[PDB]
């Protein structure tokens, strides 16, 4: 029995551009803890159903955790467009599994701003599903080469969120956990009691 507390009850989450990923296998996967958790600003599920995932067995459970703004919570969904979906975290259209998001203004907001959470604003191409791009290279937005000098149209591709306690609900920090369930032809291991 490996629960979901070590990821949900985390002291510090990860930035969306460097989202954390934990594998889970060879355990009994309960989901009453998910109901017992926070007011749960968002709890939506694609493919699986809230009362169905407790029964069927899965070969693997992939848990992706990060922190985003309340405006972009709707961007964590299959077939969606936006900065987060294009350059930070892309969910496939065939995604099976589901998404939990909850407000964390208490933890991830500090007076004067909490600049520990970053997102990627510039990228030439769209991310593939479940891709990671943690490189920090100066973004060449024009013909003139940068050569590591961030001058004029040459920018650092990562920008920090504000995350101040007084911000509106749209810009307040929200913690997001995405569960992907894999039930491949290999014998299943992770199922409920």
């Amino acid at each position, epitope marked *: 029995l490996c629960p979901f507390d070590e990821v949900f009850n985390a002291t510090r989450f990860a930035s969306v551009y460097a989202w954390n990923r934990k594998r889970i296998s060879n355990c009994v996967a309960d989901y009453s803890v998910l109901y017992n958790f926070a007011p749960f600003f968002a709890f939506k599920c694609y493919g699986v159903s809230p009362t169905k995932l407790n029964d069927l067995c899965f070969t693997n459970v992939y848990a992706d955790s990060f922190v985003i703004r309340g405006n972009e919570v709707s961007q964590i969904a299959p077939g969606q467009t936006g900065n987060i979906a*294009d*350059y930070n975290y892309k969910l496939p259209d065939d995604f099976t599994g589901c998404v939990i998001a909850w407000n964390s203004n208490k933890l991830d907001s500090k007076v004067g701003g909490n600049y520990n959470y970053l997102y990627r604003l510039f990228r030439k*191409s769209n991310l593939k599903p479940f891709e990671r791009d943690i490189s920090t290279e100066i973004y060449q*937005a024009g*013909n*003139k080469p940068c050569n590591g000098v961030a001058g004029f*149209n040459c920018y*650092f591709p990562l920008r920090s969120y504000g995350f101040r306690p007084t911000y509106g609900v749209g*810009h307040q920090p929200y913690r997001v956990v995405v569960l992907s369930f894999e039930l491949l032809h290999a014998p299943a291991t992770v199922c409920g009691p």
Partner: antibody
Framework: VQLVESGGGLVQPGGSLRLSCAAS????????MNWVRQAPGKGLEWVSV???????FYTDSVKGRFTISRDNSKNTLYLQMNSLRAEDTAVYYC????????????????WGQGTMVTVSS | DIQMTQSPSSLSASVGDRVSITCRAS??????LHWYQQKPGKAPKLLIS???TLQSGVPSRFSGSGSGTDFTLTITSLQPEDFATYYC???????????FGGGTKVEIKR
């Protein structure tokens, strides 16, 4: 950095048009590229945006009849307009979003000269 | 659905007088406010970014202040070439809600 607008003119109601924005010193397919319209004597109004990765967004009043595209061959921006109406009579600017040396997000640092589009019969 | 109101709509002042323009939003938008300057017949020019950050090549007389729902644009030494129109634009609303203000016109006083 120069953004040269072209393709403005007068058309009958319900017609089509194509506006072009030739860019210099900046790659169109690498920057947030916006089309912003300004009615004669009125204020500015955002119309459309295209992301570096290809995603496109439109305002409510132009959804379904406007299209925004890039062209990496000629390094140009294209705005295709259909089902035009008298509310479309305005000067159009192709602008770069989230630029400038301080790199301010959401701000149009570089603007074109704008071309006038008239919709009347 | 955030609407920005600029005050005053028109403001007449001579050369050398400190001039202030206020932009107020219907709701708090943090510091996602920008100040643009436009002379007639020309394209707008970005003056102030993030409600406080001076852009490159802009005289230091232009200054931005405020946050939340109230933002102020201030000119200290108002040169004769600075009698243009000024717009406040917000970049807070996510989907397509990037909107400009009504524009404050600054013109000479005699």
């Amino acid at each position: 950095v120069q953004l040269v607008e072209s393709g403005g003119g007068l058309v009958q109601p319900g017609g089509s048009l194509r506006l072009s924005c030739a860019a210099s010193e900046i790659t169109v397919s690498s920057n947030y590229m916006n089309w912003v319209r300004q009615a004669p004597g009125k204020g500015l109004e955002w119309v459309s945006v295209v992301y570096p990765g290809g995603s496109t967004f439109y305002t409510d009043s132009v959804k379904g009849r406007f299209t925004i595209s890039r062209d990496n061959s000629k390094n140009t921006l294209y705005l295709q307009m259909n089902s035009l109406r008298a509310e479309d009579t305005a000067v159009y600017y192709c602008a770069r979003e989230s630029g400038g040396f301080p790199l301010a997000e959401g701000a149009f640092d570089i603007w074109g000269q704008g071309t006038m589009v008239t919709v009347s019969s | 659905d955030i609407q920005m109101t600029q005050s005053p709509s028109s403001l007449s002042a001579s050369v050398g007088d400190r001039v202030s323009i206020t932009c107020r939003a219907s709701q708090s938008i943090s510091t996602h406010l920008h100040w643009y300057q436009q002379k007639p017949g020309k394209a707008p020019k970005l003056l102030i970014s993030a409600a406080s950050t001076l852009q490159s090549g802009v005289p230091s007389r232009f200054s931005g202040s405020g946050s939340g729902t109230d933002f102020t644009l201030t000119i200290t030494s108002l040169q004769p070439e600075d009698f243009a129109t000024y717009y406040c634009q917000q970049s807070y609303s996510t989907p397509r809600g990037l909107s400009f203000g009504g524009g404050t016109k600054v013109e000479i006083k005699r």
